Amino acid sequence: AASSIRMQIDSPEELDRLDRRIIQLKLEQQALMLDMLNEELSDKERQYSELEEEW
Amino acid sequence: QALKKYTIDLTERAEQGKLDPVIGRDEEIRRTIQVLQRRTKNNPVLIGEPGVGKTAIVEGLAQRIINGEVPEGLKGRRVLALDMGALVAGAKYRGEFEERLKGVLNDLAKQEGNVILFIDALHTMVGAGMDAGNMLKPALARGELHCVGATTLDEYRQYIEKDAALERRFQKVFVAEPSVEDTIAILRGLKERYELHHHVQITDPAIVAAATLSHRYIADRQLPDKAIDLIDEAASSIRMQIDSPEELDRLDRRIIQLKLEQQALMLDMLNEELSDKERQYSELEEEWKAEKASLSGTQTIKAELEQAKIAIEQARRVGDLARMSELQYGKIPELEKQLEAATQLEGKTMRLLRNKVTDAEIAEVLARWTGIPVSRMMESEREKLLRMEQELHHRVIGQNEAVDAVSNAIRRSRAGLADPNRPIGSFLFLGPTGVGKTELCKALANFMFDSDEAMVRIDMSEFMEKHSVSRLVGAPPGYVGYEEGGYLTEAVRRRPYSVILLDAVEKAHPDVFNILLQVLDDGRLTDGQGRTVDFRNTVVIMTSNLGSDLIQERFGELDYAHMKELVLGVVSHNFRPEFINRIDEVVVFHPLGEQHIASIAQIQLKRLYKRLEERGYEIHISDEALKLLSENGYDPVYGARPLKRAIQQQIENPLAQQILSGELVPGKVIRLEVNEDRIVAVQH
Ligand SMILES: Nc1ncnc2c1ncn2[C@@H]1O[C@H](COP(=O)(O)OP(=O)(O)OP(O)(O)=S)[C@@H](O)[C@H]1O
Ligand SMILES: Nc1ncnc2c1ncn2[C@@H]1O[C@H](COP(=O)(O)OP(=O)(O)OP(O)(O)=S)[C@@H](O)[C@H]1O
């Protein structure tokens, strides 16, 4: 149980969801080079940076 | 640096792509990570049956280390598999082997726990050269050495929990056999791997049929290994079927035959026939080369697609930006669409050939692994199987009921409708003496294999004591007959799809019936060594004669079902209730009547004709002599054998008498016409 809590502290899920989302939208925005995705990606990067600093 | 000398860097092979995509297994990899970070017991050992992907799960842990799905304390570790081989390959002197091994251990202490060591075959590791693993012992539970074990189920019980000196180190990780659909999920990342090596395409119905039929029928080995075996071996089957052809062989033999014929004739016409067949041969050769070139281009471009996927995972580890969108949205969909253009092109052009792997291929490959007809219905075996009643009545004349029940049992096992928790049919042949019980079982053996003596016929009347269970099942370990094992639990583990006759079962001592309860409950049977044999492809038939007085008394003027219930109560007096609760169908015979005995007389006279035709004496018979046999070889108390040995006596004694006399020359037809009482053999 100590190892389980050590894993859940040291390693989060929403950060993985946000990182996959920003790299996927980075793929799409690099493909499109209509956009709107600079703005969406900037919002999700700001949210990711906030959650990262809180972590 | 001995680390570069005698270790396999699995992180190197993980980054180089020399490993395999591990699918699922999040729970067990997570529990391995748990045991890797404790205070004491910092050495997980994996416990699984042999062939459930233990090394695969360790390499999947290694790829999650590379991909960074681990906690931060494991980010940057090194996975080193200890090379057993190169250490031994130069050893000559006193402990120079262990000198190298101790140098590697001092280098691991130098690496200060930043290297996660992995040594599989842990039961072999404990003695491999103070010998090989108890040099290590203080460094294990102190944060110095973190060797990760991975070893077999029984050998864990051999060399680990018995050797309790190191037992406060390692931890059980029961790597279970994954289910059917999980193995389907495994192969859908390994379908793509096996298509680079066998140059053929694999179809998803074949994968789901491979997983299901492997999990049901091959009971020695286990998932996920056996499904991989079926897929790989059927890929080899289709690779060979492509790599031949057949019409080229026909045309080549024909043109070299007509070439020799025309060269002999040097009327002709064979210059013209030869030129026509040579043009046909050139056409088929050019079509064959075109199909080979088509498959070559398809496989090269599919390998290009796979290397594109490998390079884009390399970029995902690296993190280039335009390379990602470039490789993805350029390379992947255009190679997929021209790969499928090649797929429909091969759907157009492959005529001569099966480019792909169907589920019938898995059926054939499995049917050569065991013998169970998982093969689809051809014309021969299907028409042979539909006339089951006519075949068994053209050996076992008489006894409609058991033939009906047995025919229905084997049909319900070929069509798949049989429960895979019980055997195909557990039968209990009651009835009086001499009425074709053992010949019904020989009739099934001669239908199923085309052989009378191809059935595990264990007579039960050798089992009249308490060491009889040691005879049939096996001998417990460390005794005299440990090396051979039993006669039943070995003669089925070789040959699954067979018939197991237990003749005269009531004469045996009832702990043998405890063993038969274990058989008809599980289908797996435990021997002295320990491993079990799946009896769910066999047909256990037990004969007896327990109700002989009651059936010979009362089967006349009584119905069928109440007779079955009455003699079943008699059996409940003899057997156990939990035993005969576990029987498919207790078919109960009837004594043989006159028309039946006339037919049995005709069968025995036919086999006598075959014997004296191999001897070289053709024999006709008058039907009055058949009536003499019917009136001498008939009585209800004994069944059919008075007929057989009355035939033996009254025919064969004057006949073989005169054949030894030299009176009867071969060539003429012996007419067995009647005497006033005897049967004379005449020559005319
Ligand atoms: N999760 C998985 N993902 C992909 N392939 C797998 C997976 N599990 C097993 N396999 C395959 O099954 C094979 C089993 O390899 P091994 O781990 O060597 O087998 P094993 O269970 O370790 O038995 P031994 O002792 O090593 S012979 C692997 O090499 C893979 O091809
Ligand atoms: N319908 C039948 N067709 C052919 N042979 C038969 C038939 N019924 C009986 N027999 C003969 O019966 C003989 C006795 O064989 P068995 O099967 O051993 O006798 P059973 O009546 O089935 O019972 P037991 O206990 O084995 S003596 C065989 O040699 C067969 O030739």
PDB file of all heavy atoms in Angstrom, chain B residues 178-190:
ATOM      1  N   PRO B 178      -3.970 -15.125 -19.523  1.00  0.00           N
ATOM      2  CA  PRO B 178      -4.995 -14.185 -19.963  1.00  0.00           C
ATOM      3  C   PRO B 178      -6.093 -14.912 -20.711  1.00  0.00           C
ATOM      4  O   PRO B 178      -5.919 -16.029 -21.196  1.00  0.00           O
ATOM      5  CB  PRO B 178      -4.230 -13.231 -20.880  1.00  0.00           C
ATOM      6  CG  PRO B 178      -3.118 -14.035 -21.384  1.00  0.00           C
ATOM      7  CD  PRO B 178      -2.725 -14.971 -20.285  1.00  0.00           C
ATOM      8  N   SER B 179      -7.237 -14.254 -20.809  1.00  0.00           N
ATOM      9  CA  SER B 179      -8.431 -14.892 -21.335  1.00  0.00           C
ATOM     10  C   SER B 179      -8.371 -14.961 -22.857  1.00  0.00           C
ATOM     11  O   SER B 179      -7.339 -14.718 -23.487  1.00  0.00           O
ATOM     12  CB  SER B 179      -9.676 -14.151 -20.868  1.00  0.00           C
ATOM     13  OG  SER B 179      -9.749 -12.874 -21.478  1.00  0.00           O
ATOM     14  N   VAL B 180      -9.507 -15.290 -23.464  1.00  0.00           N
ATOM     15  CA  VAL B 180      -9.562 -15.474 -24.906  1.00  0.00           C
ATOM     16  C   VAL B 180      -9.465 -14.131 -25.615  1.00  0.00           C
ATOM     17  O   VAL B 180      -8.599 -13.918 -26.474  1.00  0.00           O
ATOM     18  CB  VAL B 180     -10.855 -16.209 -25.282  1.00  0.00           C
ATOM     19  CG1 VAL B 180     -10.886 -16.499 -26.767  1.00  0.00           C
ATOM     20  CG2 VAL B 180     -11.004 -17.458 -24.448  1.00  0.00           C
ATOM     21  N   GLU B 181     -10.348 -13.203 -25.244  1.00  0.00           N
ATOM     22  CA  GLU B 181     -10.417 -11.902 -25.893  1.00  0.00           C
ATOM     23  C   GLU B 181      -9.171 -11.075 -25.626  1.00  0.00           C
ATOM     24  O   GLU B 181      -8.769 -10.266 -26.471  1.00  0.00           O
ATOM     25  CB  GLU B 181     -11.656 -11.164 -25.404  1.00  0.00           C
ATOM     26  CG  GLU B 181     -12.942 -11.857 -25.781  1.00  0.00           C
ATOM     27  CD  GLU B 181     -14.152 -11.204 -25.161  1.00  0.00           C
ATOM     28  OE1 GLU B 181     -13.971 -10.305 -24.315  1.00  0.00           O
ATOM     29  OE2 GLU B 181     -15.285 -11.586 -25.516  1.00  0.00           O
ATOM     30  N   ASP B 182      -8.532 -11.287 -24.481  1.00  0.00           N
ATOM     31  CA  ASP B 182      -7.283 -10.596 -24.207  1.00  0.00           C
ATOM     32  C   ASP B 182      -6.185 -11.080 -25.140  1.00  0.00           C
ATOM     33  O   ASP B 182      -5.364 -10.289 -25.608  1.00  0.00           O
ATOM     34  CB  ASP B 182      -6.897 -10.808 -22.751  1.00  0.00           C
ATOM     35  CG  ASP B 182      -7.955 -10.300 -21.802  1.00  0.00           C
ATOM     36  OD1 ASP B 182      -8.700  -9.376 -22.187  1.00  0.00           O
ATOM     37  OD2 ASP B 182      -8.054 -10.829 -20.676  1.00  0.00           O
ATOM     38  N   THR B 183      -6.192 -12.369 -25.469  1.00  0.00           N
ATOM     39  CA  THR B 183      -5.212 -12.889 -26.408  1.00  0.00           C
ATOM     40  C   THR B 183      -5.525 -12.436 -27.826  1.00  0.00           C
ATOM     41  O   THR B 183      -4.608 -12.236 -28.636  1.00  0.00           O
ATOM     42  CB  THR B 183      -5.181 -14.408 -26.313  1.00  0.00           C
ATOM     43  OG1 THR B 183      -5.076 -14.776 -24.936  1.00  0.00           O
ATOM     44  CG2 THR B 183      -3.973 -14.968 -27.028  1.00  0.00           C
ATOM     45  N   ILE B 184      -6.813 -12.257 -28.132  1.00  0.00           N
ATOM     46  CA  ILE B 184      -7.212 -11.615 -29.382  1.00  0.00           C
ATOM     47  C   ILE B 184      -6.642 -10.208 -29.457  1.00  0.00           C
ATOM     48  O   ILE B 184      -6.129  -9.781 -30.499  1.00  0.00           O
ATOM     49  CB  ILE B 184      -8.745 -11.611 -29.501  1.00  0.00           C
ATOM     50  CG1 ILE B 184      -9.262 -13.033 -29.618  1.00  0.00           C
ATOM     51  CG2 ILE B 184      -9.204 -10.794 -30.684  1.00  0.00           C
ATOM     52  CD1 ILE B 184     -10.745 -13.135 -29.473  1.00  0.00           C
ATOM     53  N   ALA B 185      -6.687  -9.484 -28.341  1.00  0.00           N
ATOM     54  CA  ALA B 185      -6.088  -8.159 -28.291  1.00  0.00           C
ATOM     55  C   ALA B 185      -4.571  -8.223 -28.412  1.00  0.00           C
ATOM     56  O   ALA B 185      -3.957  -7.285 -28.926  1.00  0.00           O
ATOM     57  CB  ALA B 185      -6.490  -7.456 -27.000  1.00  0.00           C
ATOM     58  N   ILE B 186      -3.960  -9.309 -27.941  1.00  0.00           N
ATOM     59  CA  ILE B 186      -2.518  -9.479 -28.097  1.00  0.00           C
ATOM     60  C   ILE B 186      -2.155  -9.651 -29.565  1.00  0.00           C
ATOM     61  O   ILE B 186      -1.253  -8.981 -30.080  1.00  0.00           O
ATOM     62  CB  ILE B 186      -2.013 -10.662 -27.252  1.00  0.00           C
ATOM     63  CG1 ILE B 186      -2.096 -10.336 -25.772  1.00  0.00           C
ATOM     64  CG2 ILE B 186      -0.586 -11.005 -27.589  1.00  0.00           C
ATOM     65  CD1 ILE B 186      -1.799 -11.503 -24.892  1.00  0.00           C
ATOM     66  N   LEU B 187      -2.868 -10.528 -30.267  1.00  0.00           N
ATOM     67  CA  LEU B 187      -2.476 -10.857 -31.632  1.00  0.00           C
ATOM     68  C   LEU B 187      -2.732  -9.732 -32.617  1.00  0.00           C
ATOM     69  O   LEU B 187      -2.073  -9.681 -33.660  1.00  0.00           O
ATOM     70  CB  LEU B 187      -3.198 -12.109 -32.097  1.00  0.00           C
ATOM     71  CG  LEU B 187      -2.711 -13.338 -31.362  1.00  0.00           C
ATOM     72  CD1 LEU B 187      -3.515 -14.525 -31.790  1.00  0.00           C
ATOM     73  CD2 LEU B 187      -1.264 -13.544 -31.679  1.00  0.00           C
ATOM     74  N   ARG B 188      -3.635  -8.810 -32.306  1.00  0.00           N
ATOM     75  CA  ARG B 188      -3.883  -7.714 -33.229  1.00  0.00           C
ATOM     76  C   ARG B 188      -2.762  -6.689 -33.235  1.00  0.00           C
ATOM     77  O   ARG B 188      -2.776  -5.792 -34.082  1.00  0.00           O
ATOM     78  CB  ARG B 188      -5.217  -7.053 -32.901  1.00  0.00           C
ATOM     79  CG  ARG B 188      -6.387  -7.942 -33.247  1.00  0.00           C
ATOM     80  CD  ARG B 188      -7.709  -7.347 -32.842  1.00  0.00           C
ATOM     81  NE  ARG B 188      -8.803  -8.257 -33.162  1.00  0.00           N
ATOM     82  CZ  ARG B 188     -10.072  -8.046 -32.835  1.00  0.00           C
ATOM     83  NH1 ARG B 188     -10.413  -6.956 -32.165  1.00  0.00           N
ATOM     84  NH2 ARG B 188     -11.001  -8.929 -33.168  1.00  0.00           N
ATOM     85  N   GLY B 189      -1.801  -6.795 -32.326  1.00  0.00           N
ATOM     86  CA  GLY B 189      -0.573  -6.044 -32.444  1.00  0.00           C
ATOM     87  C   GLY B 189       0.555  -6.935 -32.912  1.00  0.00           C
ATOM     88  O   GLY B 189       1.664  -6.465 -33.174  1.00  0.00           O
ATOM     89  N   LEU B 190       0.283  -8.235 -33.013  1.00  0.00           N
ATOM     90  CA  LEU B 190       1.265  -9.185 -33.507  1.00  0.00           C
ATOM     91  C   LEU B 190       0.902  -9.785 -34.850  1.00  0.00           C
ATOM     92  O   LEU B 190       1.741 -10.476 -35.441  1.00  0.00           O
ATOM     93  CB  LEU B 190       1.474 -10.312 -32.494  1.00  0.00           C
ATOM     94  CG  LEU B 190       2.179  -9.820 -31.242  1.00  0.00           C
ATOM     95  CD1 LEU B 190       2.271 -10.934 -30.242  1.00  0.00           C
ATOM     96  CD2 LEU B 190       3.553  -9.320 -31.600  1.00  0.00           C
TER      97      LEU B 190
END
